[PDB]
Design an enzyme around this catalytic site. Structure first.
Site, PDB file in Angstrom:
ATOM      1  N   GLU A  59       6.941   3.242 -11.153  1.00 20.50           N
ATOM      2  CA  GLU A  59       6.180   2.701 -10.033  1.00 20.50           C
ATOM      3  C   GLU A  59       6.120   1.180 -10.082  1.00 20.50           C
ATOM      4  O   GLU A  59       6.302   0.518  -9.054  1.00 20.50           O
ATOM      5  CB  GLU A  59       4.764   3.277 -10.030  1.00 20.50           C
ATOM      6  CG  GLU A  59       4.675   4.721  -9.574  1.00 20.50           C
ATOM      7  CD  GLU A  59       5.016   4.896  -8.104  1.00 20.50           C
ATOM      8  OE1 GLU A  59       5.139   3.878  -7.387  1.00 20.50           O
ATOM      9  OE2 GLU A  59       5.165   6.054  -7.666  1.00 20.50           O
ATOM     10  N   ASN A  97       4.527  -1.380   2.609  1.00 20.89           N
ATOM     11  CA  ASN A  97       5.151  -0.237   3.254  1.00 20.89           C
ATOM     12  C   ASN A  97       5.333  -0.505   4.744  1.00 20.89           C
ATOM     13  O   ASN A  97       4.771  -1.445   5.311  1.00 20.89           O
ATOM     14  CB  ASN A  97       4.308   1.023   3.032  1.00 20.89           C
ATOM     15  CG  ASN A  97       4.100   1.330   1.560  1.00 20.89           C
ATOM     16  OD1 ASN A  97       2.970   1.343   1.069  1.00 20.89           O
ATOM     17  ND2 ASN A  97       5.191   1.581   0.849  1.00 20.89           N
ATOM     18  N   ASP A 133       4.283   1.224   7.245  1.00 22.50           N
ATOM     19  CA  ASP A 133       3.085   1.483   8.035  1.00 22.50           C
ATOM     20  C   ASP A 133       2.052   0.366   7.928  1.00 22.50           C
ATOM     21  O   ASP A 133       0.942   0.519   8.447  1.00 22.50           O
ATOM     22  CB  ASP A 133       2.451   2.819   7.626  1.00 22.50           C
ATOM     23  CG  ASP A 133       1.920   2.817   6.201  1.00 22.50           C
ATOM     24  OD1 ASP A 133       1.873   1.745   5.564  1.00 22.50           O
ATOM     25  OD2 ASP A 133       1.534   3.902   5.716  1.00 22.50           O
ATOM     26  N   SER A 155       0.546  -0.641   5.194  1.00 26.07           N
ATOM     27  CA  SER A 155      -0.204  -0.533   3.956  1.00 26.07           C
ATOM     28  C   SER A 155       0.573  -1.180   2.811  1.00 26.07           C
ATOM     29  O   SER A 155       1.769  -1.461   2.911  1.00 26.07           O
ATOM     30  CB  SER A 155      -0.507   0.930   3.637  1.00 26.07           C
ATOM     31  OG  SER A 155       0.676   1.646   3.329  1.00 26.07           O
ATOM     32  N   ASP A 209       0.964  -1.112  -1.656  1.00 28.44           N
ATOM     33  CA  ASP A 209       0.704  -0.435  -2.919  1.00 28.44           C
ATOM     34  C   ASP A 209       0.418  -1.474  -3.993  1.00 28.44           C
ATOM     35  O   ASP A 209       1.116  -2.486  -4.089  1.00 28.44           O
ATOM     36  CB  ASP A 209       1.891   0.435  -3.334  1.00 28.44           C
ATOM     37  CG  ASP A 209       2.219   1.504  -2.312  1.00 28.44           C
ATOM     38  OD1 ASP A 209       1.297   1.976  -1.618  1.00 28.44           O
ATOM     39  OD2 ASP A 209       3.404   1.875  -2.204  1.00 28.44           O
TER      40      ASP A 209
END
Ligand SMILES: [Cl-]
Ligand code: NA
Length: 129
Positions: free
Chosen positions: A35, A46, A48, A50, A52
């Site tokens: 990750e 991302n 959309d 958003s 991380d």
């Protein structure tokens, strides 16, 4: 902070992730490797809108507030920036909430595609735990 393999395993164990919800410690180290490459400051945006955050790449649409994800829920009640600290406490506490959410560790795409069904025990070998 960029963690070492065994350094992170020990930190995760002390925070109660070993066998949490039935997931052995190697699963968590493997997820963190793919990750974030063990880097607490990793961020990735991302499509959309958003983002991380952190060593376990917790998403801002559901789990933390970064002030720029409209309609997000912030279910861990923490600023996303808190997930980038060298202290992984915040990321672990939030991950515990994610993994109990329903689909277990499948919530982490990297775990599902690169750790699930592999010899995850190899990620803690040689470590003093
Ligand atoms: Cl599960
Ligand atoms: Na949010």
């Amino acid at each position: 902070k960029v963690f070492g393999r065994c350094e992170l395993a020990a930190a995760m164990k002390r925070h109660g992730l070993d066998n949490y919800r039935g997931y052995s410690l190697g699963n968590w180290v493997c997820a963190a490797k793919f990750e974030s490459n063990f880097n607490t400051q990793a961020t990735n945006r991302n499509t959309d809108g958003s983002t991380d955050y952190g060593i376990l790449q917790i998403n801002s649409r559901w789990w933390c507030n970064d002030g720029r994800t409209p309609g997000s829920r912030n279910l861990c009640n923490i600023p996303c920036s808190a997930l980038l600290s060298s202290d992984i406490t915040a990321s672990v506490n939030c991950a515990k909430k994610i993994v109990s959410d329903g689909n277990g560790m499948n919530a982490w795409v990297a775990w599902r595609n690169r750790c699930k069904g592999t010899d995850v025990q190899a990620w803690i070998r040689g470590c003093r735990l």
